[PDB]
Amino acid sequence: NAGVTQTPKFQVLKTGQSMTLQCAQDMNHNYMYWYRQDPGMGLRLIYYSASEGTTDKGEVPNGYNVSRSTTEDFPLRLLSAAPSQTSVYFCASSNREYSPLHFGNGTRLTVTEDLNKVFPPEVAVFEPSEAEISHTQKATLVCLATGFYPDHVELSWWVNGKEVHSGVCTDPQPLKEQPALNDSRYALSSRLRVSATFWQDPRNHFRCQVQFYGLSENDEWTQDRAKPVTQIVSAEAWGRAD
Amino acid sequence: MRTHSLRYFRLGVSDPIHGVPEFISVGYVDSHPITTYDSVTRQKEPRAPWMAENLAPDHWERYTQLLRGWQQMFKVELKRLQRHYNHSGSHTYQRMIGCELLEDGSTTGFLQYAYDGQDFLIFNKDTLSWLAVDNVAHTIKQAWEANQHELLYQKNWLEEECIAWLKRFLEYGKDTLQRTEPPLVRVNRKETFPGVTALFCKAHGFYPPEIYMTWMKNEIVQEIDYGDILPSGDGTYQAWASIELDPQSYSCHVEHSGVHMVLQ
Amino acid sequence: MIQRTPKIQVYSRHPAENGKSNFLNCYVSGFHPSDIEVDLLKNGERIEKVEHSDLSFSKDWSFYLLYYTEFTPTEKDEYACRVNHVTLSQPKIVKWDRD
Amino acid sequence: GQNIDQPTEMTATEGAIVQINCTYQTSGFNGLFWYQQHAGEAPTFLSYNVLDGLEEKGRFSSFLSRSKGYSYLLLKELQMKDSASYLCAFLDSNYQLIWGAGTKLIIKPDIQNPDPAVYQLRDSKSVCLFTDFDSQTNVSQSKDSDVYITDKCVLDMRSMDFKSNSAVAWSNKSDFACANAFN
Ligand SMILES: *Cc1cnc2nc(N)[nH]c(=O)c2n1
Numbered sequence: 001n002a003g004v005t006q007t008p009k010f011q012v013l014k015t016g017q018s019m020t021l022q023c024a025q026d027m028n029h030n031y032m033y034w035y036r037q038d039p040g041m042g043l044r045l046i047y048y049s050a051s052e053g054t055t056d057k058g059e060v061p062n063g064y065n066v067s068r069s070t071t072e073d074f075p076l077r078l079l080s081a082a083p084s085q086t087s088v089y090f091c092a093s094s095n096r097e098y099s100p101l102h103f104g105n106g107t108r109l110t111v112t113e114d115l116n117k118v119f120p121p122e123v124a125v126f127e128p129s130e131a132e133i134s135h136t137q138k139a140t141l142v143c144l145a146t147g148f149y150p151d152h153v154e155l156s157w158w159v160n161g162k163e164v165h166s167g168v169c170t171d172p173q174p175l176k177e178q179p180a181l182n183d184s185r186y187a188l189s190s191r192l193r194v195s196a197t198f199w200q201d202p203r204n205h206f207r208c209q210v211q212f213y214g215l216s217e218n219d220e221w222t223q224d225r226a227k228p229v230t231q232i233v234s235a236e237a238w239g240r241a242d
Numbered sequence: 243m244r245t246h247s248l249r250y251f252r253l254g255v256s257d258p259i260h261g262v263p264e265f266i267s268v269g270y271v272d273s274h275p276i277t278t279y280d281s282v283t284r285q286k287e288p289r290a291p292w293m294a295e296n297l298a299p300d301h302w303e304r305y306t307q308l309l310r311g312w313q314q315m316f317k318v319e320l321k322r323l324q325r326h327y328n329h330s331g332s333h334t335y336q337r338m339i340g341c342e343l344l345e346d347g348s349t350t351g352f353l354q355y356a357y358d359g360q361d362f363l364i365f366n367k368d369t370l371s372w373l374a375v376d377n378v379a380h381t382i383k384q385a386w387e388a389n390q391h392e393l394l395y396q397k398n399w400l401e402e403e404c405i406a407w408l409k410r411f412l413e414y415g416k417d418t419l420q421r422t423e424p425p426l427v428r429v430n431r432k433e434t435f436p437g438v439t440a441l442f443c444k445a446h447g448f449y450p451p452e453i454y455m456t457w458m459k460n461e462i463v464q465e466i467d468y469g470d471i472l473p474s475g476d477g478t479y480q481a482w483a484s485i486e487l488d489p490q491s492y493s494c495h496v497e498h499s500g501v502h503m504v505l506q
Numbered sequence: 507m508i509q510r511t512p513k514i515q516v517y518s519r520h521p522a523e524n525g526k527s528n529f530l531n532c533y534v535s536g537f538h539p540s541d542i543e544v545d546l547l548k549n550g551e552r553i554e555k556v557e558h559s560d561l562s563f564s565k566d567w568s569f570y571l572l573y574y575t576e577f578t579p580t581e582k583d584e585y586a587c588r589v590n591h592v593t594l595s596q597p598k599i600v601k602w603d604r605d
Numbered sequence: 606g607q608n609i610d611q612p613t614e615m616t617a618t619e620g621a622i623v624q625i626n627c628t629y630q631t632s633g634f635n636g637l638f639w640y641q642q643h644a645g646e647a648p649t650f651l652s653y654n655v656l657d658g659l660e661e662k663g664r665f666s667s668f669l670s671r672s673k674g675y676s677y678l679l680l681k682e683l684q685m686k687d688s689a690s691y692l693c694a695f696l697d698s699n700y701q702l703i704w705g706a707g708t709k710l711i712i713k714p715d716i717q718n719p720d721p722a723v724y725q726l727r728d729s730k731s732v733c734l735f736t737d738f739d740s741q742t743n744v745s746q747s748k749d750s751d752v753y754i755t756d757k758c759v760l761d762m763r764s765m766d767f768k769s770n771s772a773v774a775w776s777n778k779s780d781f782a783c784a785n786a787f788n
Binding site: 004040041042043044045090097098100101102103104105106124125126127128129131132135136138140141142144166167168169170171172173175177179187189191193194195198235 | 609613635636638640644645646647648649650653692694696700702703704705706707720722724725726727728729732734736737750753755756758759760761762763764765767769771773775
Binding site: 301304305308391394395397398399402403406407 | 632633634635636653655656698699700701
């Protein structure tokens with residue numbers, strides 16, 4: 001079984017838009033739940049359903065509605081997007097009211113009063129220091145995603161057009177370029193560390209890939225800059241001796 | 243100094259004729275109904291006014307959602323059993339869960355299931371095991387015994403939660419559940435056939451329903467005929483015991499709520 | 507499958523006396539399955555305005571019910587309880603024994 | 606269905622042991638749960654206690670004291686992959702799932718051969734990298750708001766069975782040196 005399937009993973013909305021978060025489970029579970037997770041507090045129940053044909057309010061139901069006309073699906077509707085609804089949403093299911101919850105992969109949601117605040121990341125790869133390669137026989141590439149809003153990005157490293165994990169560390173949380181401002185654009189760093197030998201091989205191609213979540217191609221745009229749509233922004237380095 | 247109990251029953255019926263709920267659940271404290279829910283109302287409601295006055299609307303609303311959940315689970319449980327036995331047509335599934343609080347302060351808890359009104363599965367909360375009546379019950383017993391966390395959930399609920407609920411409910415209904423109405427006990431002489439005399443000891447107006455009645459000589463009597471403890475329909479019970487005399491050959495003994503009576 | 511036919515007891519709330527306002531009780535018990543029809547009769551005809559308890563559950567998985575009515579006994583008036591159930595190929599009439 | 610408390614953050618060394626405490630106040634109780642939640646991931650079920658005592662599954666144990674209103678989640682032989690939030694939750698008498706604010710667990714790598722340097726990377730056409738320092742070093746961000754500094758990140762180069770701390774700093778200021786940039 002798939003477990004709990006929740007979509008989308010990311011969403012930006014303007015103040016006043018409505019939105020449906022989809023959630024399905026193929027586990028024949030009676031209980032489905034919607035939670036929001038906000039910094040510095042416990043998961044908060046929005047709505048739950050004890051079975052198909054019934055739903056009930058959680059602790060923070062205001063601004064949302066749900067339906068459960070099937071065992072499988074428990075859609076959450078945001079009635080009229082408000083900034084206070086900027087959060088991470090998790091769909092869950094359990095067999096019974098006392099059994100362990102199975103969680104969806106979550107929906108990171110940002111509401112802004114103005115879509116002109118949305119920006120795709122600029123992405124740059126910084127080759128390794130000759131001093132590091134000399135003193136450690138190791139080489140650390142740094143990737144820098146800057147100027148993006150909202151904080152909806154997935155950073156991946158590709159070598160020779162194939163994703164890698166070993167030797168990678170990515171900041172778990174983006175930095176604010178302007179800590180004061182409330183719609184501050186974000187910056188995210190990552191390292192890929194490899195042997196000096198691997199970096200010296202001119203047959204090795206390195207690629208930092210930042211999947212950005214922004215506007216739809218369908219969204220209206222009356223600004224001179226390119227419409228800041230969902231898009232992959234990349235930068236690249238080739239290995240070499242010198 | 244008497245025993246109290248809390249019990250929740252569940253009745254599921256497959257393919258009910260149009261005028262019969264597919265599902266009913268009723269709670270009792272002693273012989274009093276406290277709570278009702280069915281598949282027609284889809285509402286949990288109080289059946290005693292002292293439950294109504296003491297539990298805010300949020301209780302009924304919450305347990306309404308829980309009972310909709312358990313109604314669905316029951317329906318799937320029955321369907322599955324009917325698959326296992328390969329039974330078509332209408333069949334019943336039943337469950338009783340509850341606990342006793344005795345005078346010494348000691349407790350009991352139980353959980354059993356019935357298919358077509360016969361013992362199917364009985365829970366042992368000490369050995370954390372299920373007694374299965376046949377091969378089909380053994381199959382459900384193995385699935386249930388493989389979920390250790392659920393057995394422990396169930397043990398705790400019977401021993402802690404059930405007893406906490408009972409005490410809360412006893413306090414709510416104290417004027418009803420903890421009162422005494424003593425029996426009015428008469429002794430009738432009836433000639434049942436010519437020459438042959440039989441004595442009837444009759445009791446009524448009594449609560450609780452628990453009562454002991456026997457006939458003694460000068461030594462208990464043999465062949466005592468017992469009437470059931472029956473409800474009078476005003477919250478009190480009636481009951482009787484008869485003996486038949488021997489040619490040329492006695493007292494009625496009643497014990498109720500810590501009071502002993504003799505009628506010679 | 508084991509069906510249980512109802513036990514049917516008819517009796518008064520109080521020692522009955524002719525001309526003394528009482529209650530006639532019909533207690534139907536130990537039946538399975540749950541589907542049942544009960545009528546109180548007065549000289550063979552159906553008494554309207556009868557009251558009954560909810561279907562009630564016993565720990566042996568059988569069911570019980572109390573049907574009762576306000577009445578005043580006489581020497582002449584006959585009273586009965588008529589119960590139908592899947593176990594009964596015809597409704598069963600049980601008459602009030604008149605203490 | 607009243608209250609539940611667990612520490613905001615704990616820090617322990619790779620290979621060592623950590624005990625995450627959770628206290629709760631309630632009249633009525635149907636069990637206490639621990640969930641594991643990795644950064645950007647779903648919470649996943651770890652443990653369920655309802656009776657008093659201790660349950661053990663590999664490196665994880667969960668204890669419950671009913672009279673103390675107290676549970677702990679015990680992690681032995683800590684690995685970097687145990688770096689996560691651990692969520693305490695219990696069921697009240699009405700099966701309401703009451704959630705702790707969660708404990709962020711930070712694991713420090715055991716750096717056997719600390720070799721702390723700051724290095725300047727070839728820019729793309731300036732980035733600085735503080736690397737190979739011991740896990741007891743805290744990277745503070747500077748006051749200067751034209752200079753950005755990341756938290757320490759732990760990378761695991763399985764290619765050389767090697768682990769290393771690093772933090773990155775950057776700026777566009779023509780007056781900005783990597784040396785002495787990390788305080
Ligand atoms: C109405 C009600 C409330 N609580 C219950 N608890 C258990 N365990 N089982 C039931 O059927 C209940 N019904």
